[PDB]
């Protein structure tokens, strides 16, 4: 059974994601600051070399970060016990509908009220610079800080987060799932271990569990709104292509 589930998810998380909360918090409190157009261009020479209007370039650099995170989330998912045994079409469905929820949950760790890390913590981009972008690009930025400031007030650590992200992936009501039963049972196991973990990791936050359940539905809405802006950008900005990985994930979402 599952007295080992929490350890396996936690180990898979630390092993697969290049950035985590301890590293993020230590770095946040030195990284090159992008606060204006001239520092953007510096960072693009120095930090983003391998990766043309500014907003579009920023849009591009964000999506490169998603491509890489999706790559890490797939490897993390295969290490969740039970996941590799699902039908490959179900595996695809779970990652497709779950990756962005997981992405924004995790992005929260590198964000504070003033900005966020970039290029593996080698940089920091300020919240005000992001707000100065022209629409619609500015609009994909601030709602994430709004969400992050509130998710971060819960003071989760990496171990809570690993269980949380596993719960987001193994989610039994994604559309078109071939075998809901097996996935719902993975889910119940993870959510059970999560509940117990939050009890012993945070003994005085009586409502953290239900609070996190709520964060799940909130991330859902957050992704729906994000996906809608990305669709607007895609149909109305001739210079903003979406990476083909991102394009499959986003296809059919509404």
């Amino acid at each position: 059974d599952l007295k080992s589930l929490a350890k396996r998810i936690y180990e898979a998380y630390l092993k697969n994601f290049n950035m985590n909360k301890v590293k993020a918090r230590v770095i946040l409190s030195p990284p090159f600051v992008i606060h204006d157009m001239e520092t953007l261009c510096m960072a693009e020479k120095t930090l983003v070399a391998k990766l043309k209007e500014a907003e579009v370039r920023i849009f591009h650099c964000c999506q490169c970060t998603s491509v890489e995170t999706v790559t890490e989330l797939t490897e993390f998912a295969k290490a969740i016990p039970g996941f590799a045994n699902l039908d490959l079409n179900d595996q695809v469905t779970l990652l497709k509908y779950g990756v962005y929820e997981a992405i924004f949950a995790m992005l929260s760790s590198v964000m504070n009220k003033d900005g966020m890390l970039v290029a593996y913590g080698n940089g920091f981009i300020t919240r005000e610079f992001l707000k100065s972008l022209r629409k619609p690009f500015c609009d994909i930025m601030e709602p994430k800080f709004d969400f992050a400031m509130k998710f971060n007030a819960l003071e989760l650590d990496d171990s809570d987060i690993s269980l949380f992200v596993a719960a987001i992936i193994c989610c039994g009501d994604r559309p078109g799932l071939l075998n809901v039963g097996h996935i719902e049972k993975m889910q119940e196991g993870i959510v059970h271990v999560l509940r117990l973990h939050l009890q012993s990791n945070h003994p005085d936050d009586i409502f953290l569990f239900p609070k996190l359940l709520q964060k799940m539905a909130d991330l859902r809405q957050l992704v729906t709104e994000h996906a809608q802006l990305v669709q607007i950008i895609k149909k109305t900005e001739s210079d903003a292509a979406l990476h083909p990985l991102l394009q499959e994930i986003y296809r059919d979402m509404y």
Binding site: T71, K96, L245, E248, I249
Partner: peptide, 8 residues
């Protein structure tokens, strides 16, 4: 979902 299937 060629590329997602590709990762998996």
């Amino acid at each position: 979902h060629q590329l997602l299937r590709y990762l998996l």
